[PDB]
Symmetry: D2
Subunit: 250 residues, 4 copies
């Protein structure tokens, strides 16, 4: 039968593009979402209209807490319940906002959301994916600009660096099980919905290759590569998909 | 007056060497401890005998919890109380143990991410908020990119500490606060580890087939806080005898 | 028309597998070689049997010298003379042998290891861009550049220089729509003459499957990078190393 | 007796500051120079006035050619001839100018100067230093911006990347002989003499720590540390001295 993938934060934007392209490649997909229930169910409907019984949704907060391990366990379980197997995990869900060091959320809430979604939830999902176990792999959505960070984003940056560490540590530890672990690191892709055009164009103008952001499809293309049989010897690699942005000095 | 430094996990091993060497350089010091009160006080006694009223201790658990922010606030405050200023923060305290992918997990998170990364972040915030040659030094790990098998959470925390080092260097540079790291390889081996397993690591090191002493680590800390490093920020100095250059 | 690609050192091993896969993808190919004329011609004949007039050979030494710029210009020109265009350059050719710090002269070692691994790539990149749609260059890098073999300093220098060229050229050619990327093998095809027992010491160190990459696995990453699936990727270097570079001493 | 150090390109700017500070620390110095004969001899005069017989000059072109190995051997030999020992090599000399990929020196000459001075000469000097062999060490002047390069500086960038490789490879290979090999990587320090003032201030304003370039002395300070007894377990390390410049995104 068809392989199955979990994509976290898959209702919109890049995570939707990944779920769609996995689906088009022939995967069955768990569309995880947190708040975006209408968007999630709408996507699942679309996919299921293309091939029936091939998409389900799964709701979970990926904020760190004492129940996050259970929630991550349940996301993986939802793939096995729906499809009988889980071949691919894409850790795409992410919180992203400033946490200035010199200063309504409390700091322990910021830590829970930015470190939880970007790093701890990927770790617990990886553990559950490996434990619940062909071409198995995990793809972590990283950030090409992790070493040239946005001013005042220390906790987000910490979380994305931790995710690089997970990608490496998990690639090493899971290789004996045949599970590959790799990352895709966008530079500027879909800009934040809240961002003004003028601010969007400032970012666009910085990109060497075309002076434009990555499309969601372009990000998903690299994910599709890493899960594919064309990447069978690739583990612990993080592919930047950034149009050269990370090479540009100040 | 004399400048003042906070050193976390300063009662034993690497943090003790750092505290001693800072003290010998003329800093007044806050010796932070969690469980090692006797050791902390013994060090303070040794330092105060050399120079009166130049060393104090500060207890705090650095596990992540609802109260870690307040604890980190207190460590920094205790420096300003004792000495009227705080010039240097050395984020040295660390938890280290395996967390296989295949203690509850959330306690492991609280220790290996809390003590290794979140507490540095909160201490950095408190240090900067409460503000010369000001600087922060984070104790990183030279083997971050070639990690020990089954140490994912530990490795995650040390990568996050790299991220903090860079992000805080950028954000605090406007305030004249430098932020740097020192990345040991094999130093004083964990007490638990066997001597045979220790020998195996020793032989792998290009420079002299031996571990770093704690004082070698402290030497790099001293450089980074000194006036000889006044343009250095966002740098992580490996002190590993070349171990990280060695392939499998 | 079908696009065209230059692959250096394409007679054997990895460069051969790259030229084959590019050809199977629909590229016309220039098969560059230095000493292996029989192998280069054999490959070109095999490809031309598959599709006529799609494969040519081009002989050149890529050792650093006064004449290397002209040689590199002529490699690129050969693709335009054969095929009327040059879409892809794969810098694959490489010299690889120890150069201890403490029977060729040292300046010959420099010329061969720095010329093949770095200088020739640079000169080919210049000739490629000057002669100019999905244009791209792929440089064969080395995943173990930061954990080098003992006594391989010149080889290691050349491969680090190649990383620099990949980044610098990606930034500089991005306005011309030319992407520049790398593929960094760990242990792939080992020497044929290397004892199986020595080959096994290497294979045992690879986390993923305790084996070396095939040439085809390396070529697969090249194919991705030149493909329309990599249209936003430039300045990136993809390790294809089975996790070898993650393993501590 | 006092230890001895070779500093390449030591007549002016950062190399001069390194030679001065090593001398101030107790070292006897070989002041290598290519064209700057007046300033070389003037510096050696100045140091010898401070302590007699503690400074010599040594002229050599570090452009790549079939005679560069002999020129490198001669630089090391000059230290032994003057001082009977050679404890420290500082690879500081450097050519630096644009070499655009797309179009009055020939390209052959641009390769010879930029790869010879920045990389090949360091390698051959390292070879000679090791072959002729307390607290021995080599310090290579690298570049903090090598992964965010100046546009059109490909050959310079290639040379500096090669120098990172040399720093690592030589640190591994020479560690058994008790020779440590490390790097110091400036960001913007003393700006080119050729450069206008508006352009200098543009670069200054990018530096997070102080919005100013490094002094030559601040670069030398890091060199002094790496050769010192306080760096005895440090090898294969490159210390950026860049005021945060390499952390700043486009
Ligand atoms: N866009 C860009 O330019 C870049 C993106 N990336 C990375 O690529 C990935 C995709 O980016 P993008 O599509 O912009 O991501 P978004 O910012 O759109 O976030 C994706 C999803 O994350 C989910 N999420 C947020 N917080 C939580 C939480 N507490 N619990 C569970 N889910 C949560 C949301 O699900 P819901 O809507 O259901 O609440 C959201 O739709 C991310 O990992 C991101 O960091 C990296 C660099 C640049
Ligand atoms: N040792 C080596 O070879 C290596 C060192 N490092 C880094 O070097 C630094 C120092 O290492 P080392 O001296 O061996 O450290 P240890 O592992 O011996 O621990 C240092 C101190 O940290 C404190 N600490 C640990 N957990 C907590 C906690 N939850 N709350 C509060 N304090 C805590 C302890 O203080 P107390 O005793 O008072 O409870 C402890 O003595 C660390 O940051 C480490 O990661 C990096 C890699 C290798
Ligand atoms: N195999 C592996 O495990 C690894 C490979 N790589 C890289 O992958 C690429 C392909 O590897 P592999 O197939 O093993 O390479 P080889 O060592 O087999 O060399 C490829 C070709 O390089 C050509 N070459 C050598 N010297 C010169 C020269 N002076 N002038 C012109 N051409 C020359 C030769 O052509 P001819 O036969 O015609 O003389 C040779 O067949 C290389 O860049 C290599 O560094 C990196 C890491 C590991
Ligand atoms: N200054 C800065 O902002 C930065 C500098 N650096 C690095 O730090 C080091 C010192 O920088 P800086 O003082 O600006 O260097 P300079 O550009 O001033 O060059 C140093 C010396 O190198 C010598 N040199 C040049 N070409 C040759 C050659 N063919 N043969 C022999 N010697 C030659 C010259 O000697 P002579 O005058 O005798 O002919 C020159 O005085 C260099 O390696 C540089 O790459 C790194 C990044 C930033
Ligand atoms: N979950 C998400 N993670 C990231 C990471 C990076 C980016 C990104 O680069 N966005 C454009 C640059 C940007 C966006 C917002 C601010 Br405020 C500053 C810069 C956007 C996102 S969305
Ligand atoms: N041209 C070549 N370069 C390299 C680099 C590494 C290896 C190897 O790891 N064996 C083999 C080769 S062959
Ligand atoms: N030999 C030299 N190397 C470099 C490297 C960088 C810079 C620089 O950033 N100038 C502004 C200047 C120089 S001069």
């Amino acid at each position: 039968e068809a392989p199955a993938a979990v994509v976290t934060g898959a209702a919109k934007r890049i995570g939707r593009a990944i779920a769609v392209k996995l689906h088009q490649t022939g995967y069955r997909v768990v569309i995880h979402y947190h708040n975006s229930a209408e968007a999630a169910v709408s996507l699942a409907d679309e996919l299921n209209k293309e091939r029936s019984n091939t998409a389900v949704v799964c709701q979970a907060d990926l904020t760190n807490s004492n129940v996050l391990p259970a929630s991550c366990e349940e996301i993986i379980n939802s793939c096995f319940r729906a499809f009988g197997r889980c071949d691919v995990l894409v850790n795409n869900a992410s919180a992203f906002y400033p946490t200035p060091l010199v200063q309504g959320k409390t700091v322990e809430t910021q830590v829970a959301e930015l470190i939880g979604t970007n790093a701890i939830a990927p770790f617990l999902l990886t553990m559950s994916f490996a434990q619940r176990q062909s071409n198995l792999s995990i793809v972590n959505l990283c950030d090409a600009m992790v070493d040239q960070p946005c001013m005042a984003f220390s906790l987000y940056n910490m979380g994305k660096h931790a995710l690089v560490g997970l990608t490496q540590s998990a690639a090493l530890e899971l290789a004996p099980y045949g599970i590959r672990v790799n990352g895709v690191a966008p530079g500027v892709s879909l800009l934040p919905v809240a961002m003004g055009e003028e601010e969007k164009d400032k970012w666009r103008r910085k990109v060497p290759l075309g002076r434009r952001e990555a499309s969601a499809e372009q990000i998903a293309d690299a994910v599709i590569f890493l899960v594919s049989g064309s990447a069978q010897y690739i583990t612990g690699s993080i592919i930047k998909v950034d149009g050269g942005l990370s090479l540009v000095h100040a």
